[PDB]
Design brief:
This is part of a larger assembly, with 1 copy of chain A (187 residues) and 2 copies of chain B (585 residues). Chain A is α+β, with helices and mostly antiparallel strands. Helices cover 51% and strands 15% of the residues of chain A. Among the domains of chain B are: 255-429, 3-Layer(aba) Sandwich (Rossmann fold); 440-581, Rossmann fold (3-Layer(aba) Sandwich), CATH 3.40.50. Chain B is 18% helix and 12% strand. Chain B starts with a strand and ends with a strand. Classes of the chains: A alpha+beta (187), B alpha/beta (585). The complex binds zinc ion (ZN) (4 copies). The structure holds a RNA duplex (26 and 25 nucleotides). Chain A: LRR repeats lie at residues 30-57.
RNA sequence: AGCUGCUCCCUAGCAUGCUACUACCG
RNA sequence: GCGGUAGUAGCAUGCUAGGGAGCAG
């Protein structure tokens, strides 16, 4: 504070007090001027020291308001993200096989573990070594889960394409050896 | 939170007691709050005294209370007034310049949009203030249209005839063809799905959506929307090209469109096409003409109603191949001759009500007269192509306004584009018309038709006119002439070949009753767009300004290839427009 | 973080608002920021007030507020000014000596490199400061060159002829052979790989890299690099050897290199070779001659462009077995007569743009005029050989400067090595030339050729001279003479053996339109290096200083084994250079 | 990239408390 | 001279909060 009502009173009080001190009139003049400048600094104390809690509290409030606004924007952002994800993953399951197996239930309830088994259009097989490959995904087509699948594309642990003519018993020690087969459901 | 409209500086406050709670800055908010009586502001939390069961909602009598804002008799020992310094305590209190001239937004807020100065300010103010005024108009109409009564049908008299019942406290609005009802069918759980209908007095005659059974207890209600704020203005700040950009001229000339070749280059170098075109001058023929100006171009067809997109379509079955074309309909009764739920294509017809968001080249607008500041701006708020057409004219009737009771809106302040043909000037017009003989061209030119247009083929000398005064006894918002429909009774049967014509009346009650003696089809000039007939009848009924004025008269006269009847009661446009006059029987 | 440039003391501060954010110490940076307008400094964190959405970016108004730097109205109760005592608060505030004379760096920063005093300070300053001036030059030209328009071709007129279309707000820069365009081919996902081209007016004539199909919508843009800081200075603090170190002489004498035996010893005992060699004085024959001075030595070829390494190559197919030699090319259109992607070898041809990092013995520089302070220093910045050659002379044109409008750069202040031929003196020159008859040597000596050169073979009395003034109507940055190309029209056909000559004009539009009446091959003196022809034609065009200065003539006159035509308009070098004068038809 | 418990160091805030100095009054 | 209240400076205990780090199951 520099331009509040107490300042003018205090300043003029001490100016007149010290002008009269330069005059040097009495002994009660000193007492009176010092009492005035004791009670006028008792005005510049409340008005210049406790006036400053108001500003600090207002700044507390302003920072809290800023924080609340930011926290309110983040919620809308994450809500939009979640509902976009839900709607984008919805656009793949609304097929005609799902409707079939749901209309074959007696209440509309089915176990979840059978939904990929009877409706998924693509299958992925992970093979550790050659004997397991020879027992499961042999040739161009194979049978699994009461269905028949046809192979397209084989990769290795480095994600590099392997041809079906390289997977032999002699060339086995030269392959990165988890193999990942991708197959499509045959009609 | 974000920037305010009047200021474009960031803010966090709301005019709570005001209509549409717009963003206002600190100084902005103080001017709007102290100049007029909206005295409730909303921060990230509302400015409300949290004392248990308090009642104060004012801004200048509430004080701070530490964490909260506290009432005077409930405020803590030492507080800090929330509204001083000429500012309201909010975010970004430093970077706010404010404004002094606040009379504009104040008047826009406190108005009820019932008289002419309302729209005067709605037009002459700032363009973003025009967006705000359009949304304010829409909100006022939505809150005033549901405030009317509910149609509680309890009888079943016949098909297209029933009996109405309405509850206490609400009158029943004008049973007009301007505002469509909406019904829902009763069941034990809910009540839904009858559709949109249009009622009037009979017995009560109804214009039904589609044939079904009329149950008991179903309500018919003027249901409102949930309208949203706007983003883009009415039109883009304009510009003339240095080249034919995004386009390349054709190679041949067309017989149907050799009358518009001079209009090809004139907008090939700019965005908008401000058109001054009387009804039926080749108004829609250019929509297919400029369409094949360059068939590879992306042309956006807007519509006023599905009737407007039909008038856009009713000719597109021949000159247009349907290899890739569509029109939009959200989940009713109309023409759907093209693809459904197809948006980004060679051509998409659309009514603005459900247009998707894409980017295109050409935009063929349907007549601008109906379009307000809202609906015209919606199109470029969702589809921002970068050269436009604005086919249409203030030469005809706009979409009616509900409570426009005081001085009627002037023929210049319809919307944005409609002002700059008599402020800047028009560039588009066909020097040819398509129906009008000599009686409906040259004398009409002394009107707002600019002394500009000729006839298609020459005089018929068959338009009729009378000399009478009229007697009327009127219902809630309708008016029927017992004598003036009795004098046309003498004109019809005693002219045996006269009865190809359709008699028109803004008070369709006249056409409701004239079918009891004559039976001719009913029609009003509320939707005189699309109706283009050989023989027509019309009368003046009351001599007041509801139908006598320019956009109210001329919507009906420009109709015939041969002639129409003109039954006048007043002498203004009797002295203005002159036709064949005879003796009165 | 590290030491600063001007002061060499460790620091942690930058000029944020300045160009290339150099390191600057406490008082060091204070002088740089208070003497001029850069008032944003970057420490490990930037010097900005973290007040939510505040604005200020000054340095002398922000204060310390505990953990962070805050604004005045934002600062806490008691602070500590960040910018006082004549220092800015930062790392190593004690060990900082500062400087008083800061006008150098201030001028170098606030300058726009448009006029002559710009380069005067760019050379006459501190060598590290001149490296910084080089990088500032490169950054300024990069920023100003992408600021121009984008070439959006829409038509297909012919092959080597199309039509251009450019966007609003950006003008179209001079379509010159000096700055190469760059285009990318459109597809649905991205747009890449058309290459670098050169356009000019036609219809638009294009100079394409390699034959392909011209699609629709491809843009051609003057793309920019990602220029990097420099490490080594322009040249080394120099030295005279006591011995022939790392070298030993040859044993025999070579016929073609018997004229340069006195030039072998004189640099074998120092690093650099200050060359004063006019175009065509055995300029490159020593590049293969001094190469076989000792075939065991490692010689480094540099080039201004791929054409320069071609002139360095177009005679390396005969005297040089290709057992171990190569040239560098990064992932276009040019000669590749040696190994690719072979770097550490006996002989390394290279353009400075992609030279690897090694250490060798010889360095055969390519003509110095084109090289600025940046690219000449790049060589020793990556390959630090320890004795050099500097083939070339300021006797010809440099690499041109874009926005040099006020008085053009002087023939001394090209780059570093350039100045000490007329400040300390040259040691390098062949007392024999290779093309020049008596007409092109003796009178050219009163020019900056030092009264130094003789003729190769004697006089021809055949180089022509004109007497006229010329009439010009000029395009955006080009200018063609209707009459002065009409005066040569009489000289050509009336001297039937005159047309083995190529007429050149720095305003290549003249050569564009002269091929429509004569058909002679087009060429500009911008790349007059490498072109060495018997008959040549030249003209004056405008008498202004774009071509009138010494370095703008002397690239064109010194061409012929027999003779050259010179169509004069001005009188300065008409009085300076004399040839046979005749009657004007 | 998890759930808990314990410990060390630095900063800021508030309350409380201690102690010292100036002023008013009794 | 003492007591009280209003001020200014230093010290002490704990309580919340923010940041870095270590151990164990
Ligand atoms: Zn309000
Ligand atoms: Zn209260
Ligand atoms: Zn700087
Ligand atoms: Zn700040």
């Amino acid at each position: 504070f520099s331009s509040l009502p107490s300042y003018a009173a205090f300043a003029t009080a001490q100016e007149a007090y010290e002008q009269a001190v330069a005059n040097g009139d009495s002994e009660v003049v000193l007492k009176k001027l010092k009492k005035s400048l004791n009670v006028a600094k008792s005005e510049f104390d409340r008005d210049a020291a406790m006036q400053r809690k108001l500003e600090k509290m207002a700044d507390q409030a302003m920072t809290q308001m800023y924080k609340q606004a930011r926290s309110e924007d983040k919620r809308a952002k994450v809500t939009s993200a979640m509902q976009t994800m839900l709607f984008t993953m919805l656009r793949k399951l609304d097929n005609d096989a799902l409707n079939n197996i749901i209309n074959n239930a007696r209440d509309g309830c089915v176990p979840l573990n059978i939904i990929p088994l009877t409706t998924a259009a693509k299958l992925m097989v992970v093979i550790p070594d050659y004997n397991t490959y020879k027992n499961t995904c042999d040739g161009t087509t194979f049978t699994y889960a009461s269905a028949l699948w046809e192979i397209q594309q084989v990769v290795d642990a480095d994600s590099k394409i392997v041809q079906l003519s390289e997977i032999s018993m002699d060339n086995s020690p030269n392959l990165a050896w988890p193999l990942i087969v991708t197959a499509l459901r045959a009609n | 939170v974000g920037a305010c409209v009047l200021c474009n500086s960031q803010t966090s406050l709301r005019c709570g007691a005001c209509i549409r709670r717009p963003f206002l800055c600190c100084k902005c908010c103080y001017d709007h709050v102290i100049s007029t009586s909206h005295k409730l502001v909303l921060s990230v939390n509302p400015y409300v005294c949290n004392a248990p069961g308090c009642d104060v909602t004012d801004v200048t009598q509430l004080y701070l209370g530490g964490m909260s804002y506290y009432c005077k008799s409930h405020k803590p020992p030492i507080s800090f007034p929330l509204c001083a310094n000429g500012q309201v305590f909010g975010l970004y209190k430093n970077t706010c310049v404010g404004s002094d001239n606040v009379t504009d937004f104040n008047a826009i807020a406190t108005c009820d949009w019932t008289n002419a100065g309302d729209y005067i300010l709605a037009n002459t103010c700032t363009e973003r203030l025009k967006l705000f005024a359009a949304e304010t108009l829409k909100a006022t109409e939505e809150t005033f249209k549901l405030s009317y009564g509910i149609a509680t049908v309890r009888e079943v008299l016949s098909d297209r005839e029933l009996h109405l019942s309405w509850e206490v406290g609400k009158p029943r609005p004008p049973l007009n063809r301007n505002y469509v009802f909406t019904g829902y069918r009763v069941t034990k759980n809910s009540k839904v799905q009858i559709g949109e209908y249009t009622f009037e007095k009979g017995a009560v005659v109804y214009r039904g959506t589609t044939t079904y059974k009329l149950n008991v207890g179903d309500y018919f209600v003027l249901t409102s929307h949930t309208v949203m704020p706007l983003s883009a203005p009415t039109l883009v700040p304009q510009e003339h090209y240095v080249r034919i950009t995004g386009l390349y001229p054709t190679l041949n000339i067309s017989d149907e469109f050799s009358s518009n070749v001079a209009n090809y280059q004139k907008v090939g170098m700019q965005k908008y096409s401000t058109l001054q075109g009387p009804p039926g001058t080749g108004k829609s023929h250019f929509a297919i003409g400029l369409a094949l100006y360059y068939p590879s171009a992306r042309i956006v067809y807007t519509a006023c109603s599905h009737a407007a997109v039909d008038a856009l379509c009713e000719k597109a079955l021949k000159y247009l191949p349907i290899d890739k074309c569509s029109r939009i309909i959200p989940a009713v009764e109309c023409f759907d001759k093209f693809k459904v739920n197809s948006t980004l294509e060679q051509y998409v017809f659309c009514t603005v009500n459900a247009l998707p968001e894409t980017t295109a080249d050409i935009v063929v607008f349907d007549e601008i007269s109906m379009a307000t500041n809202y609906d015209l701006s919606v199109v470029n708020a969702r589809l921002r192509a970068k050269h436009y057409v604005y086919i249409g004219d203030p030469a005809q009737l706009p979409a009616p306004r509900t409570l426009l009771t005081k001085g009627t809106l002037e023929p210049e302040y319809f919307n944005s584009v409609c002002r700059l043909m008599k402020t800047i000037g028009p560039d588009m017009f066909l020097g040819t018309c398509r129906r009008c003989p000599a009686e409906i061209v040259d004398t009409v030119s002394a009107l707002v038709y600019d002394n500009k247009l000729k006839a298609h083929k020459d005089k018929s000398a068959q338009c009729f006119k009378m000399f009478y005064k009229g007697v009327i006894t009127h219902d809630v918002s309708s008016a029927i002439n017992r004598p003036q429909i009795g004098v046309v009774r003498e004109f019809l049967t005693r002219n045996p070949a006269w009865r190809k014509a359709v008699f028109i009346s803004p008070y369709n009650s006249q056409n409701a009753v004239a079918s009891k003696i004559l039976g001719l089809p009913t029609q009003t000039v509320d939707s005189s767009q699309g109706s283009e007939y050989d023989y027509v009848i019309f009368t003046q009924t009351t001599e007041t300004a509801h139908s006598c004025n320019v956009n109210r008269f001329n919507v009906a006269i420009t109709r015939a290839k041969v002639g129409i009847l003109c039954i006048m009661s007043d002498r203004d446009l009797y002295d203005k427009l002159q036709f064949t006059s005879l003796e009165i029987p």
